[PDB]
Design a protein around this ligand. Structure first.
Ligand SMILES: OC[C@H]1O[C@H](O[C@@H]2[C@@H](O)[C@H](O)[C@@H](CO)O[C@H]2O)[C@H](O)[C@@H](O)[C@@H]1O
Ligand SMILES: OC[C@H]1O[C@H](O[C@@H]2[C@@H](O)[C@H](O)[C@@H](CO)O[C@H]2O)[C@H](O)[C@@H](O)[C@@H]1O
Lengths: 751, 751
């Protein structure tokens, strides 16, 4: 294994427990996620072991992605004394995430209190090609001594969720079985709700010039921990190779009756291959993914590197073979928001996959399709019609948002997002349109897509309420993208998005009636669709209260917003993030005009075609002045609309905010997991902002870049109606190369 | 609670995990022992939770006293973040063991990274009067802030034995039950061999001016840990009282059918009393014990304090209500030698109890009596007769010595002590005589004592082998007190001790035949004793090969010893302990004349009446020159014989060695547990050495002091035939005060 080059490396400086690097160094393959802890598992680290879709409620407030037993532990002992890296003199330290090869690397040269010197060097990864597999390989040298080493692999089943919060700790599994099967050790568990079973088998061994060299292997069952141990008569200066493979299998996979037999079998297979061979296969997969998703920026090193980071995690975490899971707000990298799926996924993350690797995006939309029944059921129980998707979603598709939590002052506060942040249903509809238009995946549109757009439209129809006074439908008592303001009327974003969803749906019925009548009838039997309905949605859409006002040009975020006390940002913190104006009480945010994130501006981005350059700029200017960027969702939208109204400084400032979200820990809480929307925002800003990509009405791809001065060039690729397109953007012109063909496609350049 | 005065306090300087203070601060009441860890249980501490007599083998090499779940844990949280004392600025630290009151105390004033300042102050103890009880009480003040505190009591069932040695870790119990019974939390376990069950119930609560002030109590079952949590709205500067009682109960106690009900009931009772009330009762017990066992030294502060330490642990660890356990080589303070009972107990520890609190010594001898069947069985299986007590003894009375371990170079070595260190059987006999002579407990002698002395004599008779050449019985292929030399012939100590045991036994038969004929027949039916036997023992005793030689005067430690390569101590370490002469190979100790500890000199101490002042001094001088003091048993014997041959410097040097054994960590391994023999050696040296107590043939107590110059005075008390005697010893004369009378007793002063 040779480390990649440096533009490709992210480096931790000090050897220590780190919440931030636990997150930034999390590895995942879309099924398994492993937090970036050190191998020895220091007292203070917070391990994370997840498997997509395995959730549990038990005694907790809401269901949660389960922190499983931690399987990666590895410790060294010299004559039965544990070589503790934290109790040594660190002569050399290197620790980097290699983004090109998708591995985590560590080299250590240590000097213990008895003056012995040992180097430990190697890496781990979570196979991109083999979804159940995790691979570790470390090399040990005793530099100036001989001894008996014990190499201790272990699986630790004391892990819990919410480790550091005494009120919220829960253990979400129980152990079913522990076993030394000679070839490895096994531990398997069942969730407390009894819905999933997971099995973990693992085999370590120790070589010297490729031949097994341990004189003794023993095993220990200490109740909640099982260990596999290898004793070596180690000779000064020799190179001992440690190789540990581990397999996770869950009840979520197919024809897995006995997780114990499935694991052992699987491991037996993977063990016919070396760690190098498995790494090579791993890397081919990363090649294949980067070959399309990589994005070179010339002339800004900190940005090129940063963006690579964002993109890495994006390509690591989606698994297109899985149509029953999607991406939670923090990936598979942490327990923030507990693995729940938000609009984050459909609106911020999904575009990367649509243009980058559209199969992934298809699977993520399958996740929502498969939970239509739960969205219907959710609407029924609130008194509505259609599919009302929940604000937070897990495995079952029921609403999973907490009824309460802690505000910015650490006090209890009611949470109403799960009750009245309705826009989620439109955003999903929107994302179905958005996937389809880029892919021309008509089959998807016919069998799945249109049901979704139609069933959400039925819901918006149900909640729109008519007002004779102003002679317009309203949607009242709501929360829009700006979570700071609760129980409002006619949130602009909400109404346009509702309008949009009602319209697309009537238009879709027409398309299908005329151009696809067998499919329209398949569908009509299925969801009782009558061709009188669409007229209803049109009637409603045409009267939904949009507020302008014709001149003045300024979109009120919601009725009454302008009557609210006004504040002026001024003052930024060391990460260039807004600081609370003075006199703002953090639990009275309802009273002020400061906003948490893009809301009206969010509207301008997604419904670009409805607002002219001037309305965009007027509203962009009014709201940026007033955005606190208290979600990681925010900067990217302001970077992208920045460029689009031609304010390229505001833009680059805001871009550097989304790109550095976790690497500089902008928001103060990277330790809870990767900020996954922010990753996709970062990508969106590059491609649809600075790269000047956009979509003209009749589905013509336009390009219309606007590099920040500072960047000599920008290449990225994307997939457009089946065509894989490489753009290179210089300050002057734009190159274009169709690397894969499917029909002739219309492109429309600068200028 | 007011701390005692200072002469009475032992203090740890730095706040840290410490193997040594885990030992030195271990608290016990003779049934329960708790290692001296801090309440929070830091990553690196080694907790110890023992109950006398509960042993388990499971997958281990030999049976072991079980480290039970750890019940004392207590942590504080501020707004759900754990207040970690190791991650704070320590503004004040006090931690002392108070030897007079028998409690462990800690005051902390901390400043956490958010600048909050909190003081935590209180103590714990293991009730001397109530054997199942442990008490903790801490006071919390938030100095400069208000918050929600969580007070977290917990019982941690992840504990194992041999925590730091990967080859030897075993978990010796499994959990049977966990329970929140509203009034507390419960966890109970069963040993893996299935011989003992233990239950632990525990109840915490939190007061403010004596009234319950937590607004919420919740519980958590995290599998191998259960917690009880108390939430308080804490006001700046208020004094929150935390009080946690905990109860251990085991299957070893009587009419304990359901350990769960017995614990809960017990706790319910103890909870009708406050921590102060329980402390007061605790202290009365310590008063009562110290009132007799205390020993004032005037004019050497470091010695007075030290001796108090030694005596404290002695009075803490014996429980005279228990006739089925005795004292293991490391008390109930650690897992060194795994709670096994050696001659340490009978010869070094027992004298303290005989003279200090003779009921204790009676119970310890009951331990051996009750295992006579196992000692018979042990002799039979080696081809011998009588009772052959094992070298290491646990619950069953079978031999428990390891077949192998690691030598001084960390390599595997065969251990033969369990096969051929036979003297143990004599030492026990001896201790029975020794208890009886001080106590005049004739009843004990008749019903129990004499069986023991007789059955061991039957064994010595069986192993003595006749030699026609020298016309003497020999005992060959042996290990004597000096473990350095293996497979030797006619170890001097062994032969005199055998002779002694054969003689006492024939003499005892005579006493009983003549003066107690009903008892002699009770006994004779019981162990098939014929009045022909004693003649056999006499015949043998009179020919046992004693080596002199008439002039020269020097007792060869064993046949051939003088032909061994000779070395010269020279050079002492920073604790004034011998350093290995150069050219000595630590795994070839058989070849040299260096000895591990008192052996011939051991003989001079126990059989004083058989050697004259000159033979004593000649042999003392020859062997001290050559003793490495590589057991903690050694210094004390050399301090005591020092004074007795009149070498008072050698004496004070050696005394300061035994007294400082654990407080200065002389032997390098205090972390494994208190060196319990060394405690009793220390006492023996004071009383029978410097205090000049001795026993003239016809059981007259003589006094014949010899203070080191430096010590103005020395008072100690002792019990002699039922009379409690206070001696005060000055450089000039000796005062004496009978505080309790039982007949007139002969005393014989200086001079
Ligand atoms: O990325 C997740 C989510 O984060 C922010 O809002 C959170 C809200 O959606 C959630 O219901 C509550 C409780 O779980 O926490 C809020 O902070 C963000 O504002 C939101 O738009 C985003 O999707
Ligand atoms: O205090 C216990 C014991 O310690 C020393 O000897 C140990 C020996 O008795 C034991 O069999 C082996 C293995 O457990 O370890 C030895 O170090 C001491 O020499 C001895 O006299 C003493 O009773």
């Amino acid at each position: 294994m040779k480390l990649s080059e440096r533009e490709w490396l992210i480096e931790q400086d000090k050897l220590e427990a780190s919440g931030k690097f636990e997150t930034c160094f999390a590895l995942t393959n879309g099924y398994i996620g492993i937090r970036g802890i050190n191998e020895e598992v220091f007292c203070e680290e917070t391990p994370g072991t997840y498997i997509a879709g395995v959730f549990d409620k038990s005694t907790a407030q809401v269901t949660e992605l389960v922190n499983l037993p931690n399987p990666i532990g590895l410790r060294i002992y010299i004559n039965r004394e544990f070589l503790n890296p934290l109790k040594c003199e660190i002569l050399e330290f290197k620790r980097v995430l290699d983004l090109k090869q998708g591995i985590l690397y560590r080299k250590l040269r240590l000097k213990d209190v008895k003056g012995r010197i040992t180097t430990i060097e190697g890496f781990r990864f979570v196979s991109m090609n083999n979804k159940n597999l995790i691979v570790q390989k470390y090399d040990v040298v005793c530099e100036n001594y001989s001894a008996v080493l014990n190499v201790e692999s272990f699986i630790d089943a004391t892990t819990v969720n919410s480790k550091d919060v005494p009120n919220d700790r829960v253990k979400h599994y129980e152990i079913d079985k522990k076993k030394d099967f000679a070839d490895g050790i096994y531990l398997g568990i069942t969730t407390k709700d009894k819905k999933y079973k997971v099995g973990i088998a693992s085999s370590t061994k120790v070589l010297l010039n490729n031949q097994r060299c341990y004189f003794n292997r023993f095993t220990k069952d200490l109740g909640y921990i099982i260990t596999e141990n290898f004793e070596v008569e180690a000779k000064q200066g020799e190179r001992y190779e440690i190789e540990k493979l581990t397999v996770l299998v869950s009840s979520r996979e197919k024809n897995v009756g006995d997780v114990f037999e499935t694991c052992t079998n699987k491991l037996k297979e993977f063990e016919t291959k070396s760690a190098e061979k498995l790494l090579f296969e791993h890397i081919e997969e990363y090649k294949r993914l980067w070959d399309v998703a990589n994005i070179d920026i010339v002339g800004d090193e900190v940005a090129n590197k940063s963006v690579k980071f964002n993109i890495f995690h994006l390509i690591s975490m989606a698994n297109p073979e899985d149509e029953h899971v999607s991406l939670g707000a923090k990936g598979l990298h942490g327990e923030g928001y507990k693995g729940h799926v938000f609009w984050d996924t459909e609106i911020f993350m999904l575009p990367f996959y649509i243009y980058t690797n559209p199969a992934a995006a298809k699977a993520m939309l399958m996740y929502r399709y498969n939970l239509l029944d739960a969205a219907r059921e959710n609407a029924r129980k609130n008194g509505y019609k259609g599919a009302q998707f929940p604000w937070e979603s897990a495995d079952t598709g029921e609403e999973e948002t907490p009824k309460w939590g802690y505000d910015y002052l650490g006090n209890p506060v009611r949470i109403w997002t799960g009750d009245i942040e309705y826009h989620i249903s439109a955003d999903i509809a929107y994302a179905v349109m958005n996937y389809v238009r880029a892919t021309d995946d008509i089959d998807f549109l016919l069998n799945y897509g249109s049901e979704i757009i139609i069933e959400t439209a039925r819901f918006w129809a149900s909640i729109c309420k008519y007002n004779k006074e102003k002679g317009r439908y309203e949607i009242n008592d709501v929360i829009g993208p700006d979570e700071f303001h609760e129980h409002c009327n006619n949130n602009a974003y909400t109404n346009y998005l509702a309008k949009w969803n009602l319209l697309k749906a009537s238009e879709l019925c027409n398309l299908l009636l005329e151009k696809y009548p067998k499919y329209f009838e398949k569908l009509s039997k299925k969801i009782n669709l009558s061709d009188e309905e669409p007229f209803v949605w049109q009637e409603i859409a045409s009267k939904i209260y949009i507020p302008y006002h014709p001149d003045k040009k300024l979109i009120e975020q919601f009725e009454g917003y302008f009557n609210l006390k006004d504040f002026v940002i001024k003052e930024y913190d060391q990460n260039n993030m807004p600081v609370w104006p003075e006199g703002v009480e953090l639990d009275k945010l309802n009273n002020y005009q400061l906003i948490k994130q893009a809301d009206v501006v969010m509207l301008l981005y997604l419904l670009g075609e409805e607002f002219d350059d001037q309305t965009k700029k007027i509203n962009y200017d009014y709201y940026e002045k007033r955005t606190m960027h208290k979600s990681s969702l925010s900067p990217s939208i302001y970077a992208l609309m920045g460029v689009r109204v031609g304010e390229t400084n505001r833009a680059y400032i805001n871009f550097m905010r989304t790109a550095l979200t976790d690497l500089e820990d902008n928001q103060g809480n990277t330790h809870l997991g990767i900020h996954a929307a922010s990753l996709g925002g970062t990508w969106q800003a590059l491609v649809f902002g600075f790269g000047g990509i956009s979509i003209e009405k009749d589905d013509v791809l336009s390009v219309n870049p606007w590099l920040p001065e500072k960047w000599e060039s920008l290449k990225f690729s994307i997939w457009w109606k089946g065509n894989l397109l490489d753009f290179k953007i210089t300050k002057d012109n734009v190159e274009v190369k169709k690397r894969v063909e499917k029909g002739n496609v219309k492109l429309k350049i600068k200028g």
